[PDB]
Amino acid sequence: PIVQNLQGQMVHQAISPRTLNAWVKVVEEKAFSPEVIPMFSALSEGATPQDLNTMLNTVGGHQAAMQMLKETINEEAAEWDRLHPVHAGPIAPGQMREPRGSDIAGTTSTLQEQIGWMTHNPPIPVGEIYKRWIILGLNKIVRMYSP
Amino acid sequence: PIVQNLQGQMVHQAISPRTLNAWVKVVEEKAFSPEVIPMFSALSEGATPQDLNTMLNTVGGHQAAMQMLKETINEEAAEWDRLHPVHAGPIAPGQMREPRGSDIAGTTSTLQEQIGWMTHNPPIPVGEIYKRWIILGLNKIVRMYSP
């Protein structure tokens, strides 16, 4: 995640193993139950896309759901690209590039790039955009997996 | 929560997973027992409204009680709005807006707004107002759930 250091700057720090394991354990115990979404939200505080793929990729089991989510993440990403067209002409030397759906999904962007966008002024909340897609896709799952 | 940093300022820091889990475990084990209220009170030290909705939303089970509480929180909030009318004329550029019942419940306010009110001079204790509503609603529950 990207956290604030004592000095008063935003720097990246790694997520903790008993945080990781707590994510694992939630999924083990409460599967598709709604409490998973606030839980997720708390444990995703200050998290990167990269950390969010890590959390999704580290799941075991419920592979039908994991595939449905993936496909929702790509749909929501396809929709990001649709709604926000690429911008006019070449990229400025003085500036950094606008993200695509795949940069938001973490796929085409690097960590330093993910830190550029979030730490820069104005900052862009690429975590929160992926977060809604995850929560939206979580609703899809919850609604389906209701019996 | 909003905690004091080493430098001597009040800054927000996230709540810990084994704190979260300790909240979960209390509820699992002691359900509606009175010891839940001091326990709550300790674990709510320096907490935001946002963190208080997180704690309430992360409950599983006892949904009749959770609904009774919600409805108590809204009643107490409706009462906040009644007792404290909105103030005269437009909001000053030099000042920040007075809260409503829904800002106290965390609903209409953002985190930075919740930090503005609490950290500013004079500070306003929107946590402690929600806390009484929670404790009051906890009494309602305890009294009902006595057999």
Added chain:
Amino acid sequence: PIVQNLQGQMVHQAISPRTLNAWVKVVEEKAFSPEVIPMFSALSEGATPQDLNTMLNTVGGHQAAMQMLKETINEEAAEWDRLHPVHAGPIAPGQMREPRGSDIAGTTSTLQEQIGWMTHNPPIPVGEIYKRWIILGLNKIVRMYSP
């Protein structure tokens, strides 16, 4: 691992016992399952070759796989030496030596040497080169150990 200190420099710090034990426990529980690879990747964040041999050497059980991996690590290392020939003439006093496959595998290099290469400017990512060999060799194993 080599981590950034508060002062703003990269210094070595030792890996933690409950990190070590978490590595052990993953292997105990999920054996050759694919979730082992992201898991590995997270727990190998900022890790040295030396720490990576420590992790491999501390395995118990699955010795056929451990030997297959070793032999993959040496093949990938032999390939490093092939692709990157040694450089022209004697080593400069002002400079430090280029790594071989065995320095990447941690075998012929010392820790201070591993810190020289990574902390120096430009830095060389000898962790990430070993990491791919480990991940590649992990694919070999996963594919074989599929039933």
Added chain:
Amino acid sequence: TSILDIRQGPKEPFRDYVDRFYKTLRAEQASQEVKNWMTETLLVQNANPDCKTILKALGPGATLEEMMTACQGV
């Protein structure tokens, strides 16, 4: 399971039923106004005859602690 399929048993305490209701209501994502409509309507409708009778006597305007204490002996 659908919200329409939530019903109170002939021997099941209302309380255990109301818990089931706001759990399933917790998995419905509809507008609040619709969920208010579901609350006043479906809850009583799928309540058992003995309690149903009781709840009809509370009239309208009733709140959950009063419903929950009203159908306790049933």
Added chain:
Amino acid sequence: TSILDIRQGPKEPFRDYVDRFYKTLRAEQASQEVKNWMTETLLVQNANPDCKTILKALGPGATLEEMMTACQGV
């Protein structure tokens, strides 16, 4: 176990089968285009006659939530 050996039982819910499929698909390392080909093809082909029948009625263009809700009673 090979991906061709993944098949749906005569009493096995599709759901439990689809989970098995993307787990084994998760251990295949092939190009995405090939894995897309495997998805539309092999999944339905090794699906049981009763659900297979059902899936033929969805036509093409179908997505996983609709397949998964389509073969639920089977």
Added chain:
Amino acid sequence: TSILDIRQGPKEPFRDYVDRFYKTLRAEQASQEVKNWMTETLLVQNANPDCKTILKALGPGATLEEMMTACQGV
């Protein structure tokens, strides 16, 4: 359960009863003066005849260690 429903068994040690009393008293939220009234009154009143007899001999002014040691053999 209501505080009036708290009573001492015919074979139940007083001690186990006094624990039950301040647990239920712990779920009463009344003014302290009322809760003092409940203490001196209801506790003895719902105490069993054998201990009740004992407690009448302690007279008024008695404190909990002396009541608790007074009804120990009963």
